[PDB]
Amino acid sequence: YKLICYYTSWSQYREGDGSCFPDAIDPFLCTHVIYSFANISNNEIDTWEWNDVTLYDTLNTLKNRNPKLKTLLSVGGWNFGPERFSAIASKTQSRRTFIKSVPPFLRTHGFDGLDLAWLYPGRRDKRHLTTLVKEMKAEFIREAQAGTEQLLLSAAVSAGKIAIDRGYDIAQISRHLDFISLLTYDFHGAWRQTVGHHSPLFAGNEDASSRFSNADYAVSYMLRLGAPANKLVMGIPTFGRSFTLASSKTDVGAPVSGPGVPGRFTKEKGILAYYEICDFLHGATTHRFRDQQVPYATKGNQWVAYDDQESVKNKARYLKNRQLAGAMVWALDLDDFRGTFCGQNLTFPLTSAVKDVLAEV
Ligand SMILES: CC(=O)N[C@@H]1[C@@H](O)[C@H](O[C@@H]2O[C@H](CO)[C@@H](O[C@H]3O[C@H](CO)[C@@H](O[C@@H]4O[C@H](CO)[C@@H](O[C@@H]5O[C@H](CO)[C@@H](O[C@@H]6O[C@H](CO)[C@@H](O)[C@H](O)[C@H]6NC(C)=O)[C@H](O)[C@H]5NC(C)=O)[C@H](O)[C@H]4NC(C)=O)[C@H](O)[C@H]3NC(C)=O)[C@H](O)[C@H]2NC(C)=O)[C@@H](CO)O[C@@H]1O
Ligand SMILES: *[C@@H]1O[C@H](CO)[C@@H](O[C@H]2O[C@H](CO)[C@@H](O[C@@H]3O[C@H](CO)[C@@H](O[C@@H]4O[C@H](CO)[C@@H](O)[C@H](O)[C@@H]4O)[C@H](O)[C@@H]3O)[C@H](O)[C@H]2NC(C)=O)[C@H](O)[C@H]1NC(C)=O
């Protein structure tokens, strides 16, 4: 089983305990650690933060303590304009330019692979996405001839039915990619005036209608479309999405005024880190959708949809039962990495819970 974990570039800037640097990562926790995100300048991959080469270096030293650990650099991300990927990929010339610039960059900074996070490809992009993947892999195969271990190519893919149908030729890119990370956690939060969980495992017979917005459907779909199970990796969130209630109602379908109040450390309306959620639970009412098998909490007028050790162990069992390649976690720096916010003294409680199930039979 693979355990793919993302570490974000911008987490170093959070104040106090929220600050997270690469050396806080347990080397033996995941099998693959992906650094987010790289930029693209002059059609070449490039750094993003002023100190990335130092952090790249700190992250890759982890391999001195654990030789089996693989690291990858991810390009793209939500805040990355998909138009930019679109323009680079639709022109054979700028596409070859970006592709050719990737291996030397990865080899200089000690990475073992590239992760593609184009979010998201439209109907007019499908054909070019397939090309970027093909040519990128061909180039990695070419590059291994020099006697080095071949570079890995992976991609983070939307788990939304319409998004998949619209921009991805799953059967094609599946044969060229080493693994595919299913983003099974942004199903409900897309500013949509009402309450709901963003990462349910199952559909649940109540208020069913977007029968497609749950992990079980997304996995089943990807498999029907042609992706091999041994290359699929299910995404497991380490954060929660919050809402500000518009009334005293707390059950499903309850109206919402907008996103939740920022977290003290993450300072971003709408989301909370697992460690902030831990603090938040004191004096809150915790509920759990049986059908969807995920929890939520309320306090005053705030409503939070999140994942705990139990829902995360549950998802890991599901994933083993369908024989997938493993799990993907977003993100290490949103988990209780210091291990001093959630109680039972454990560093990375959520990710460790996923690791324990995977390590079981
Ligand atoms: C919200 C929503 O609806 N979107 C979701 C998507 O998120 C989702 O995408 C996938 O799933 C992840 C979670 O859903 C998703 O989220 C993450 O993506 C973006 C980036 O792509 C993250 O954006 C953060 O936002 C930060 C602000 O909150 C911002 O922080 C600022 O960062 C800069 C530098 O990075 C700091 O500047 C530096 O400051 C110091 C001094 O302070 C100086 O010394 C430096 O020189 C400064 N200069 C610079 C520029 O370096 C600044 O301090 C800091 N603070 C501020 C002002 O707040 C980050 O920069 C920015 N990151 C980027 C790259 O833009 C989101 O926060 C992430 N969300 C969560 C949650 O973590 C991923 O993109 C994606 N994952 C995968 C697998 O790819 C999609 C579904 O895919 O669904 C929705 O669209
Ligand atoms: C990620 O890579 C991106 C490049 O592909 C890059 O985004 C930008 O990259 C350039 C660097 O800033 C931008 O260039 C500038 O654009 C402005 C026009 O608005 C021009 O005029 C001015 O320049 C003045 C100083 O010289 C400044 O005071 C003014 O405010 C004004 O900006 C500049 O001369 C310059 O050309 C690119 O336009 C932009 N790329 C795209 C496609 O939009 C990011 O910088 C890079 N790293 C990150 C985001 O961390």
From Swiss-Prot:
Keywords: Antimicrobial, Apoptosis, Cytoplasm, Disulfide bond, Endoplasmic reticulum, Glycoprotein, Inflammatory response, Lectin, Secreted. Its main location: secreted. Residues 302-316 are annotated as: Important for AKT1 activation and IL8 production. The keyword Cytoplasm applies. Glycans are attached at residues 39, 345. Belongs to the glycosyl hydrolase 18 family. Monomer. This is Chitinase-3-like protein 1. It comes from Ovis aries (Sheep).
